[model samples]
Target: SKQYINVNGVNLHYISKGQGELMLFLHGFPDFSHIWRHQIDEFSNDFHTVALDLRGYNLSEKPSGLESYEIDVLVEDIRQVIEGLGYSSCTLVVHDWGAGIGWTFAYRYPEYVQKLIAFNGPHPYTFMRELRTNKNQQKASEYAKWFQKQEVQDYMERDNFSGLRKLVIDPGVKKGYLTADDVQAYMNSWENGSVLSMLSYYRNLKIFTEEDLRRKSLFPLEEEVLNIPVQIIWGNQDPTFMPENLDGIEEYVPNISVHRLAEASHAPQHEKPQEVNNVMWNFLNK
Candidate 1:
């Protein structure tokens, strides 16, 4: 079951279970709180697991306009959620666009995060570094450039969101991690008018152009190295991101640990729940 809370003037919906320190799960594009169903069930016994439908997805409020989806606004949404949940700080677990917001939040409001667990998504600052210098990461991020187009949303929303299904749901089903019912739940959320608002995230994301990187004006570091303890879980087979993104990340997050799922892809929790849970348990306990 899901409950709604008011955060930053928006109605946000989340499914919470068990009782203990807050363990906040933030999902990315093409996904909602349901993406954490397995982890929610697994971790709730020990932690108060709350998986949220990001502002533009599923049962959450879908505010119009690209400004509403800006990175700062997205980070603020997470802040409100933590405060609303009666916590001064939280253990943040995020993936994809969720991780984008997480990286920014942890950087700007270091005190609000006790620890961070990022899956698949790279730090925004480091990603900017790669965007400037790493050809491999630039190639991997080409999809983001395409997603910035206005027509991409129409193509993605066509035929009951078949395009997104091709990217997210189909792979999970084929790998035996997701079932028909699981996919139906996701489909139901997709039908709730999140297309434009969801796509707005990419539209609002800031990227450095090749020219900006070629010049010295773009090279200054605007963010400090994150001070919080961090753990990263990566699926090596992820097609959207490469190993290069993980390279030299320790420079930004000094106190960090990483777990690589050699056989798994982007959605490691779904693709390998038991493995992910085990790693999380050890890190959270230690």
Candidate 2:
């Protein structure tokens, strides 16, 4: 029930339930394994739910430097988690940055993944290209510019609430979505390590773009057709994804099936548990 595992060198933390084919839940920046609390309780009745804090977030180790939190290293951590569980192939439910690496994991080692469910973030390649040409996306990225700074990390780390109440959630739900208890739990893990490592994911933006262009030249990743079944559930109200990002996702992931959450925002698993669980159960069973 504790969810912390030292499978890889890092003291990875995860919440799990049920007993069946493994289902891996990967979280994003500024959040941890606790983000999937709703899904864990809901799916524990059916699936062997495994929701990870992911490296450098919350209970997981926050190693210093951008390289320590590199994309490939994170993906390897997820792979190792599944291998450690002895599940040959697992379904992946990813949110925010978690989906970013989840996409890479599905592509690089297709054999290990059965299906992928990504919430807000897109395939890394397409996401970067969109950020470049899509003017609005550039604005959304401005948050990262401030987030990666030394001053921001230092300031947020000092707050009694891990500054999460002040920074992490979308304004609309800030008061209602997070409770006093939740705030304390978040601060406990949020203050664990170097904030810079979380911010480092942003520093490689240029490298991601160049990689996107290279991949696009070969085959449009946005529309790149692959055999694996993919289901995309996006929160229409997500501030970072902007308004219409999910509109053209099919142009990239050809075989994907998408579900739109009209009132939901970035952390759908936490904000809209009932809906997320229903859709997820139906899709996974189908």
Candidate 3:
């Protein structure tokens, strides 16, 4: 069964199974808790696995206003979830935009994240470098700017989510990892949740200013900032995030493990579940 927690002044929904060390899963943009369904099924056998529908996704509350989605507030939501769920720390596993939040959360609240598993999400510093200097990356990430435009909801949800189908599902189906049913389930979440709320993530993102970068260069990104054990899983073929984004990540994150899926794209967990699960299980148990 699913559970709801009152935290950060909103009721966040999560589904849990199994019983052991806390392993919390967070999905990214255009996704909900169901994205971790395969992981919840397998990990629950030996770990207390829970997947959250981040605020504004699926069954979670969608508070209006841009301030409601700020990074600090989002980080606080994770803090409240841990305390509210009766856990002090967790093995945090996140994908895409969830990993974006996880990166900032892990850096700020190192005491709460025992181990970090980030899949196909770039480190903030490295990402900013790419965004600032790499023309290709700038071009690729332009879609984010597009999503920030008003009424993107109409485009994404139009013709029964044909836009989303082309973006995530069709490629997933061709990879032989997702089924038509899986595609329908993702569509159902979109129907159950607000498209505008989902898109607000990109809208509310804090794009670092020129002064911020200049100041960062003065104090360079220090390794001590995130001195925690981290495991990164990346799909080599992600179009939105260039593989070059992974370069020099170890400079900021010291203790690290990395896995590369040569044949997979963005959602490697779904495109290559067996490999992703085995890698995560080994990392968690070891």
Candidate 4:
């Protein structure tokens, strides 16, 4: 069922199904709750599945300003949403920017996350290490740097969101993963959400500075280590995040399993739903 909950004074939108342990899904970058349709369909059979449209996307409240999009604030949104749903803890399934928030949430509130299954989102520390030293990773992140520019939304909005269509729709259509209706759904989400607020995620990034990187820890010193089981599903062909980002992740998260999809790229959940579902099921059962 589609629903809404207010967290930190912001009204967020979500879709829930089934009636078991909470299994929450978070999407990222130009996508919304609908992106997890396949996972929600499969997982709802065993777990109470909820796919959230992160603040500033789709029907969710879009709080203005870059500060509102800060990592801490975004993390708090997830925290409050879980509590609002009467879940003290949950199995978090995330992709892209959602994974960034999920990783941070795990670091700060480890007890609230029973397990984490991430699709193509890098751990902050490993991502930072790569951004600082890996040339390919830096090159790949150029689009993020471009997103920080003020004119980004204008360019993205042109030709009826041709850029997004190219980035998200075209490939899916070519691969036979997305139908015309799916493309329309995504288009509707983009039309309903705040493009500037969405871009603020890139604009509000705190990881780029030398001082930010020099910091000894991201989370509170005491909450630095993540002891929970984490499963990572990475699409090897992802141009945005190089495969190298997966390296050194186990240092921070000791209990982790990684599954690489050679045939997929970026949004593996959409591109390879059956495979992604199997991996998630195995991880959840284990």
What stretches of model 2 exceed 4 Å from their correct place? Answer: 161-163, 169-175, 207-223
Indicate the residue-level lDDT of 208 in model 2.
Answer: 36
> What's the TM-score of each model vs. the native?
0.94, 0.88, 0.93, 0.96
| lDDT, candidate 2, 1-286, per-residue tens | 7667775578787777889988889888778777888888888877899988877776677777777777667778988899888888898889877887888788777788899888887665567566667778877767766765667766766656445546664352463766667666776766674466677776654423456544542222332545588888778878788656666667656778878889888777777878888888778878
| Deviation in Å, model 3, residue 105 alpha carbon | 0.5
* Candidate number with greatest lDDT: 4
lDDT of 2: 0.73
Model 4 global lDDT (CA atoms, 0 to 1): 0.88
* lDDT tens digits, residue span 1-119, model 4: 89899898899999999989999999999889998999989988889999999989999999888989988899999999999999999999999989888888888888999999998
Give the winner by TM-score: 1 or 3.
1
Name the lDDT of candidate 3.
0.83
Q: Give the candidates in order of lDDT, highest first.
A: 4, 1, 3, 2
- In candidate 1, what residue range of length 10 has the lowest lDDT sum? 212-221
- Tell me which of candidates 3 and 4 scores higher on TM-score: 4
Tell me the whole-model lDDT of each prediction, alpha carbons only: 0.85, 0.73, 0.83, 0.88
Compare candidates 1 and 4 on TM-score and give the better one: 4
Q: Which ranges of candidate 4 are over 4 A from the true structure?
A: 216-222
TM-score of 4: 0.96
Q: What is the lDDT of residue 79 in candidate 4?
A: 96
